[PDB]
Design a binder for this molecule. Structure first.
Ligand code: CHL
Ligand code: CHL
Ligand code: CHL
Ligand code: CHL
Ligand code: CHL
Ligand code: CHL
Ligand code: CHL
Ligand code: CHL
Ligand code: CHL
Ligand SMILES: CC1=C[C@H](O)CC(C)(C)[C@H]1/C=C/C(C)=C/C=C/C(C)=C/C=C/C=C(C)/C=C/C=C(C)/C=C/C1=C(C)C[C@H](O)CC1(C)C
Lengths: 163, 195, 73, 222, 60, 192
């Protein structure tokens, strides 16, 4: 996209220099070893480490000197940008399927009790913890339920409004 | 006749058809009216490819250039030549009689009411009487489709080879025979794009 | 004049044989033709989409002389 | 059942009669019977692949440590083999894709319909090679040329294959992680651990315990 | 039609259309909607029972 | 006889000509497959008679078998015995196709089963055949004599793949150096 790597971008280096300069300008009003001086020094160290880490990660910077993420799985894989969107996509989808499968399993387990509505606002905490730990293996069980036809309710068993 | 994937269930509507190996994994022939249309379409594609492959290969064996090197006299300002004999036609008259001859033949083919003669017309198209015996005709129907399916893959094999390497069909066969383990579809930068 | 298409026949013919669209577009000629609100909805949908197209194409491909230099316009 | 992975726990009932079963399924992945059959086949295939791989890594490495042969190490053996390979990289990949497509489709079709690859017309006359034993993951035929599946110790060999398979899978993942963390070979890692086991382990390779996640590593040190 | 038998509601304007309820009682005096059905869910009015005709309920 | 004494032979291999019960992988279990494999074995064995008798007989007449088709690629002319021989390599494959494919097409056109394996009639000069008592005896002789012939021809190819030399001279190296010259000494058959 016409971008340049942040490790060689002049705007990136200028932004790091300006942020460090502003923090150092704030730093000179306090005595050495005081709590504000230590806090500002820790902020300066974090700023330097962050700019170094963003430069070392292969991030691409625009004309504004700011990192730009690449989200097409093709351009990310062939140019080393998969850690920006693609691997976070896989991680989020795994965790989201975990949460959804744990909720579905808890709802289905509570459906079989004598008071199904009771477990929805007074949580069965041991059962919820057991079901929550079992959500790690959600893709296998979910894909099997999809192949078996047990994941979906039949259309004849679901209420609809008159058309 | 067999199974394209041994040990697998084949669709029931494909049983008894000529050249049938139970291959319809997408279920395109599930509709009976579509399956009848696809049977004529497969045979017409087969017969055009069988003549097309023999025309493309047979002209090279007679030293008249490859199938790709045929029509550039239209764009290079040249003249047509059949076996060295000049042909006194231009593109304004070659396509005109092509539209008249082909669409005239295709209009007669489309007008047949019954399903069998839309695939196997016979009559004037079978002067040597190969359809006199039912046993020979049924076996020849399997022979036609199996040869036709090979020619359909060969002509697409002509196009895909030339779009990837730029060489001729017999040129690529010579290249493959000269070094098989280093000259194939894998060794060009087109078929597998990420090496 | 005896030549041309009949829209009812076109609509009735366009039903996929696999049954994916059910009966297809059968009876839709009488639905569209007898309903002024169907015709008004189709006309407004197309006209509003064309109005958006006009907006998107006059700024980027200005058709009038000295229009691109008139920023307020 | 070979035993209990957690003594005192309630083992699942669907893992009672499987070979190599210790009742280990806390995630309940094999609760569905079709899933259990598919995962039995998957564990066997993974086990045999890891078995052969760990053999082809460890036996050359042990022979090199004893000084018998001088072969390239496993993480670099692809480089030295490809330079002396008559067949280049792309056609090797294509040939592997073709061959594995064929043999894995045959294995998959036998899994879906047992004994189907041994029926008449399944192969071009050679379907007797793959008649099957009627068991999931135990093909036989050419794959058992010595015919020791008909012997009395068939059930013990099934247990031996599965346990050695799990050991081999853990061993290959250990080889990969040990290279990625230490940068050296597996026998080198073993000899470093045998020289000083307190100081040479995963807690000192600088990778397995990250410094940011474990600030006490840099604090509680001499 | 029986007592405490699962039935599926076929009345389209009913809140429990395509849903399964339990038969409470069936009136035998020839009224228009004799089948009394109890449902596990309430409708928008908070009611859990409704009366249906013979053709409006299918035994499941 | 038996290929492995004490082993239980398959029941479907009993009564066959040249039968030793050798089918550990069950390739001939189906009778339709078994019938075709006998014709495949006999044709493979009979062609192995011609290959060995040729390779060995020609070099007993001073004519290597590997060096025989070495006048077309490098350059030269075909030669049979000592007579200057006509035709060219391009013409040789033309007569190769018409003679063999014309003969092989008649090999399987018959509806009989024994005739595909054991033709008789015009294919048995000098009498022979007769009723049963010596026909089955040379039926056993044909498969066993044919079996070494295809083992030897594969051995002819494999030896030249490992040593690059002829079989007759490599026999002489096996008598000159019986313990220092065999398939174990060269670094091709057994590496390391
Ligand atoms: C088990 C597969 C496998 C693994 C773990 C490795 C690992 C390695 N190879 Mg290696 N290779 C593998 C298979 C093969 N390699 C090679 C050819 C080479 C060469 C020429 C070189 C290496 C080198 C290396 C090392 C460098 C790191 C790397 O390249 O990561 C690769 C990591 C992978 C996981 C590769 C992907 C393997 C894949 C998962 C196999 C299965 C794919 C199938 C399509 C399965 C798909 C699903 C099915 C169900 C449809 C590393 C130790 C080199 C190195 O030393 O230099 C720095 C070196 O020069 N390999 C071939 C030839 C075709 C293989 C065949 O499968
Ligand atoms: C919203 C969907 C979507 C769109 C609009 C694009 C768009 C693009 N992709 Mg991406 N991708 C998309 C989803 C996905 N892609 C990929 C995997 C790839 C690869 C492997 C490649 C692309 C490439 C490309 C580019 C050229 C594609 C083309 O047709 O060349 C004609 C183009 C920028 C190519 C490239 O990276 O840039 C040129 C390329 O090599 N995509 C996956 C994984 C299956 C996706 C899901
Ligand atoms: C069991 C939890 C649960 C599951 C599996 C689903 C699943 C779904 N929701 Mg529903 N939801 C769930 C809880 C809740 N949802 C909603 C409100 C909605 C709306 C308004 C919509 C959906 C839609 C959808 C669908 C598309 C995914 C999505 O949009 O996520 C989005 C999910 C949310 C915005 C709420 C999620 C809250 C929380 C992360 C989930 C609840 C966690 C449980 C409390 C966990 C308890 C488990 C313990 C006890 C073991 C999908 C069928 C959409 C649709 O129908 O697609 C076709 C849609 O428009 N949900 C609320 C009230 C805020 C919930 C509580
Ligand atoms: C393999 C061969 C073959 C293929 C690929 C098709 C393909 C098609 N045919 Mg068929 N045909 C084929 C063989 C033959 N057809 C026909 C005769 C016909 C007729 C008469 C008709 C078709 C039609 C169609 C179309 C719809 C079919 C359908 O059921 O839609 C199923 C559709 C759905 C189930 C709905 C899907 C909705 C979708 C999920 C909405 C998604 C919206 C997005 C979320 C929102 C927008 C997102 C943004 C990003 C775009 C489809 C393009 C119909 C047509 O469309 O003509 C152009 C039609 O009228 N075919 C004959 C006999 C001559 C065949 C031989
Ligand atoms: C991919 C390899 C693999 C597969 C498909 C299986 C599958 C199976 N295991 Mg085996 N195992 C496998 C590897 C290993 N297992 C074991 C130890 C055992 C025991 C002790 C038992 C089983 C049993 C079973 C069966 C029933 C449980 C199940 O449904 O699992 C389905 C599994 C999957 C679908 C794969 C899920 C993998 C997941 C993504 C792993 C991700 C997190 C891992 C912890 C990461 C690994 C890091 C490690 C290497 C440090 C089934 C045949 C039980 C059975 O009854 O005997 C047959 C039983 O008692 N396994 C070890 C040694 C640690 C392995 C290495
Ligand atoms: C998972 C199995 C496996 C894989 C992927 C490799 C991979 C490799 N080995 Mg290794 N090996 C493997 C198992 C074993 N090896 C060895 C012993 C060796 C030695 C001694 C050497 C290698 C070498 C090599 C490299 C050069 C490729 C090659 O061998 O030429 C390809 C060879 C052939 C194509 C001919 C052999 C064909 C083979 C007999 C077919 C067997 C098929 C069977 C059905 C078994 C199928 C296996 C199962 C798991 C699918 C390559 C990185 C060399 C080296 O390390 O680097 C240069 C080398 O010198 N291997 C043993 C004995 C302990 C194994 C068990
Ligand atoms: C087959 C099992 C196995 C064996 C015998 C070894 C052996 C060894 N590893 Mg390795 N590993 C093994 C699997 C695995 N390892 C690793 C990751 C590593 C790393 C990163 C390192 C080692 C290192 C070591 C050394 C021990 C010090 C240590 O840090 O422990 C490893 C600690 C662990 C928590 C992994 C243990 C996994 C094992 C499956 C636990 C179960 C063991 C069984 C209960 C009993 C096994 C008995 C033996 C006889 C089979 C030693 C040479 C170190 C070395 O390279 O230099 C000294 C080192 O830095 N391992 C993983 C990925 C999680 C494995 C799976
Ligand atoms: C261009 C070389 C080419 C040759 C013969 C081919 C072909 C063959 N020769 Mg002829 N040869 C060739 C040159 C020469 N040959 C011979 C002398 C013979 C002899 C004596 C025999 C053959 C035999 C054979 C055939 C064995 C299989 C067969 O069909 O039998 C059918 C084989 C086809 C054998 C044969 O034909 O079997 C009866 C055989 O006995 N070759 C000499 C030395 C005069 C050659 C130079
Ligand atoms: C060791 C050499 C050898 C032996 C013992 C036999 C044995 C037999 N053959 Mg085979 N043959 C042999 C070499 C060859 N045969 C054949 C091709 C044939 C044919 C085409 C036929 C025989 C027939 C016969 C039978 C009677 C004729 C005969 O040759 O008797 C010694 C007898 C069972 C005939 C038959 O099967 O029964 C009458 C018959 O028609 N053989 C070729 C190819 C030229 C050979 C070289
Ligand atoms: C039975 C079964 C049983 C179970 O079940 C399984 C198993 C075990 C697998 C199996 C066994 C087996 C066997 C081993 C196989 C192998 C074989 C043979 C070797 C073939 C051949 C094959 C061989 C034969 C044909 C032959 C060929 C020959 C030829 C003629 C040659 C020729 C030559 C000579 C003349 C000389 C000149 O100058 C040249 C030439 C021309 C070059």
């Amino acid at each position: 996209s016409g971008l340049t790597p942040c490790s060689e971008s002049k705007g990136f280096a200028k932004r790091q220099k300006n942020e460090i300069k502003a923090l150092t300008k704030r730093l000179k009003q306090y005595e050495e070893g005081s709590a504000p001086s230590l806090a500002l020094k820790a902020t300066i160290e974090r700023t330097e480490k962050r700019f170094a880490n963003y430069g070392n990660a292969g991030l691409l910077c625009g004309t504004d000197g700011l990192p730009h993420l690449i989200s097409d799985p093709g351009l990310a894989l062939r140019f080393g940008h998969a850690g920006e969107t693609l691997i976070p996509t896989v991680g989020f989808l795994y965790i989201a399927g975990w949460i959804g499968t744990a909720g579905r399993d808890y709802l289905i387990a509570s459906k079989g009790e004598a008071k199904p509505r009771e477990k929805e606002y007074i949580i069965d905490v041991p059962l919820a913890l057991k079901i929550s730990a079992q959500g790690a293996g959600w893709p296998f069980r979910v894909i099997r339920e999809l192949q078996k036809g047990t994941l979906l309710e039949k259309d004849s068993n679901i209420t609809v409004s008159p058309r | 006749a067999g199974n394209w994937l041994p040990g697998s269930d084949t669709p029931a509507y494909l049983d008894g058809l000529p050249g049938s190996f139970g291959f319809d994994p997408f279920g395109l022939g599930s509709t009976p009216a579509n399956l009848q249309r696809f049977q004529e379409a497969e045979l017409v594609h087969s017969r055009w490819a069988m003549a097309g492959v023999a025309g493309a290969l047979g002209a090279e064996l007679l030293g008249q250039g490859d199938w790709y090197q045929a029509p550039l006299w239209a764009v290079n300002g040249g003249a047509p030549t059949y076996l060295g004999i000049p042909v006194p036609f231009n593109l304004s008259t070659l396509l005109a009689i092509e539209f008249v001859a082909i669409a005239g033949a295709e209009a007669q083919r489309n007008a047949e009411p019954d399903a069998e003669k839309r695939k196997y017309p016979g009559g004037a198209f079978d002067p040597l009487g190969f359809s006199k015996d039912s046993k020979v005709l049924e076996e020849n129907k399997l022979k036609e489709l199996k040869n036709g399916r090979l020619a359909m893959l060969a002509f697409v094999g002509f196009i895909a080879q030339h779009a990837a390497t730029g060489k001729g069909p017999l040129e690529a066969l010579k290249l493959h025979l000269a070094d098989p383990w280093g000259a194939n579809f894998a060794t060009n930068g087109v078929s597998i794009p990420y090496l | 004049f005896g030549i041309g298409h009949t829209m009812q026949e076109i609509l009735d013919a366009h039903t996929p044989p696999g049954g994916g669209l059910g009966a297809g577009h059968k009876g839709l000629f009488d639905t569209v033709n007898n309903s002024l609100h169907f015709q008004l909805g189709l006309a407004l949908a197309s006209v509003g989409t064309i109005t958006s197209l006009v907006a998107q194409h006059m700024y980027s491909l200005p058709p009038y002389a000295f229009l691109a230099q008139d920023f307020t316009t | 059942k070979a035993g209990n992975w957690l003594p005192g726990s309630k083992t699942p009932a669907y893992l009672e009669d499987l070979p190599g079963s210790y009742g280990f399924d806390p995630l309940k992945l094999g609760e569905d019977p079709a899933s259990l059959k598919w995962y039995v086949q998957s564990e066997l295939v993974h086990s045999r692949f890891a078995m052969a791989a760990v053999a082809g890594i460890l036996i050359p490495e042990v022979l090199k440590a004893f000084g018998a042969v001088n072969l390239p190490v496993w993480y670099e053996a692809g480089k030295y083999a490809q330079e002396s390979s008559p067949i280049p990289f792309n056609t090797l990949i294509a040939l592997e894709i073709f061959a594995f497509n064929f043999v894995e489709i045959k294995r998959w079709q036998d899994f879906k319909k047992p004994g189907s690859q041994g029926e008449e017309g399944s192969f071009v006359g050679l379907e007797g090679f793959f008649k099957g034993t009627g068991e999931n993951g135990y093909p036989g035929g050419v794959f058992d040329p010595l015919g020791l599946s008909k012997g009395p110790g068939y059930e013990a060999m099934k247990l031996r294959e599965i346990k050695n398979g799990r050991l081999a899978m853990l061993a290959f993942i250990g080889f990969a992680s040990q290279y990625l963390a230490t940068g050296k070979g597996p026998i080198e890692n073993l000899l470093d651990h045998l020289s000083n086991p307190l100081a040479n382990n995963f807690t000192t390779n600088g990778t397995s315990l990250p410094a940011q996640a474990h600030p006490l590593l840099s604090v509680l040190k001499p | 039609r029986l007592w405490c038998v699962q039935v599926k509601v076929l009345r389209p304007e009913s809140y429990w259309f395509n849903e399964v309820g339990k038969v409470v009682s069936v009136d035998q005096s020839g009224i228009r909607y004799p089948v009394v059905v109890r449902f596990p869910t309430v409708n928008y009015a908070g009611v859990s029972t409704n009366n249906y005709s013979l053709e409006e309920v299918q035994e499941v």
